[PDB]
Design a protein around this ligand. Sequence first.
Ligand SMILES: [Mg+2]
Lengths: 63, 138, 155, 217, 137, 120
Amino acid sequence: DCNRALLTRLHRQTYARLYPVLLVKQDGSTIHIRYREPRRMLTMPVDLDSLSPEERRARFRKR
Amino acid sequence: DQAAKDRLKKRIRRLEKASQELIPIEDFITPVKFLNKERQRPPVELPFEESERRALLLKRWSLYKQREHEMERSAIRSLLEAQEEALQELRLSSPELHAEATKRDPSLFPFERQGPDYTPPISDYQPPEGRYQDITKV
Amino acid sequence: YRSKPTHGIGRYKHLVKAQVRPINLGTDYEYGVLNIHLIAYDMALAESYAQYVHNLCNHLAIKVEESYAMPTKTMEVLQLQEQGSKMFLDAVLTTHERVVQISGLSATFAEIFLEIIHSNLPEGVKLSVREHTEEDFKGRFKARPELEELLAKLN
Amino acid sequence: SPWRLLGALCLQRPPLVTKPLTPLQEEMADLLQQIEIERSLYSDHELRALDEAQQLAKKKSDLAQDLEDMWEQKFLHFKLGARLTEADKKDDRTSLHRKLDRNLILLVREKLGDQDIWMLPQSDWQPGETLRQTAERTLATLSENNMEAKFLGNAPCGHYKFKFLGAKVFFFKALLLTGDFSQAGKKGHHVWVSKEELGDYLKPKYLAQVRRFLLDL
Amino acid sequence: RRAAPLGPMPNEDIDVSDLERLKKYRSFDRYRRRAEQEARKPHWWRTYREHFGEESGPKDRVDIGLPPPKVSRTQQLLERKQALRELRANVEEERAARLQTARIPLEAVRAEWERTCGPYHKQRLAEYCGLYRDLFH
Amino acid sequence: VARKERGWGTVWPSREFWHRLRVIRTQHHIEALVEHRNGQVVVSASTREWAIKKHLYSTRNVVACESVGRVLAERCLEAGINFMVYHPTPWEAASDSIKRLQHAMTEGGVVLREPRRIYE
Ligand SMILES: [Mg+2]
């Protein structure tokens, strides 16, 4: 039942050419996204770490 | 002194009586750069085989959509009939129970849910580091 | 005419009108003005699922208040380059939010309705259902720097 | 008429992975992509590629492809997650991570003194309690696990009676948000099951029409 | 002074309260259909039909004619249904309907009209032209 | 030299005619009428008729409107009525089916927009 509203187009008059780019969040999941600049893969990066995770990120960057 | 507070309260009243006009929506407005990228876009002569395949596929899609809407409406009707005979059964069971169960709970107020994705989340995966800078115009 | 039995045969203004709190009563709990937010990075999925939600409301006879759109939130993807402590530009990620403003339902039809919504969520759509507060109404409106300047001069 | 008091719960697992397209939706997706290309007003990547092409043609008469190769290479280097966590194990109906496409429901197995039941999880409440909190304490107690599950609301959904004296049963419906099941190899037989092999497994007349208010999807 | 109406008001059936729940027509064509349906009913007030020559209104028409042909309704319906299914079975019918290029044999249409409903149509032309009025009243 | 019913104007359509073409486009069938000012129907061509119904395909089409127009034009020539007034709605005037139905009426030989009254 997740396939109901997926089958659609852009209904506007003037619009650029879009591409089915696969995006990943801070996890293993992928989502199909109409996005320009026809790269096949797009990734989202880790932000700000945490108070006890900034030191772990610094240690991972050092190692 | 007090005259400063008088002209101040005059200012809050005067800029309060102005309009609360909305932000424009970017998506409803065609951008300016989209004008001159049309001269090298030629029309495509659509062949008859492609046109008839598109048309018959549209007829099959319309029939399938009508049938799928019909079974979704049948499912919601079955759920509603079950819930009708259900509330009748509980009302015949106990008065205090339908006094309690006709509520919408305050825990429903932050109802948030995320749609399913293409691939499942994998374990032991480390995406790289980065930052986000908000360029949304205010 | 007044004295005739055919008086008021031309009466029409009582049939067409042309000139919000939740009502919590204890037995019939009709709850008022809610916003259903549909958040996606893709134009087609956001607009089509807003269309599907609005058409489902029209079929299920909810008096819909509005069907509107939030302004776009443009996130920027700056990533850390390999072998360096450098930032490079990767993606311009636009976030679009299509919101359906519904007036009133019941609790029963809230289980039915939200069950159909998260059964029918497409790929890459974040669902949110909340009430109508002051902040959700102020979200479509621009900043008020002159009013914050006046309030800061007050304080 | 004496009444015997039983709640019950319907613990719905949401799908994680979208289902594959039927062939009619696949060919409609092809049509929709074709008409998006037909109505598309080019792109900044294709404009640059055409401009570089015509300037190199004019220079030889008198890069976008590198980016294409790099993007395809970084796509081919990346391996995606496995869509099929079902067929690689092919035996376990017990695990929470069993099926990703369909909706899943929980059953547990108990042997009674006078009955042998294959049962959706149920309850028992003293009359001072409310059935919503009864379902919450049942979920917190009987499965000995940390299931952060969002209940839908106060209104019940499943409603069946069997009379000996009568005995009365009220199924609720509640959706899982996040889960943590301790002691995965416990002796209590719990199964996460979908609608078709649910219909295969469930014998009773009272539990035969749980599919009436379970969504088919 | 107020008097009592002799019969029902036209718009008293629908509820004044809760206007949002009542379904609306949004089509002027739907209003045209509804108004032309409403104008043909015998209202109790003074009407155009009463004053402008409806030719006695309801008239008990004495029929001096041949019996209608007795045709089996179920057999007629099933043969019409089977002919329709064999007509929609073709693909070239779909092609001719879509591409706006299809013709009908008007001579065969005229023949089947003369067999089927031509009697009733000629009866209403004779009624309109007053053939019955000046011959058989 | 007969009396037309001049007047009205606040209502629509104008009732100043001897014969009027009435096209009812139902979601299934297409039904055209030639109506006198009395309200009686003179000649009608509908796709509810079995005589047309076994001859056309897909009762709703523009081609169905063409069949209706040609059949009613032939029936009007058979009934001796050659003039009528057609008053379409401005969104029905731009439609494909009504325009080519008027084309079929013109090619059929029925001239729309009735002649002016003598000493009106
Ligand atoms: Mg019959």
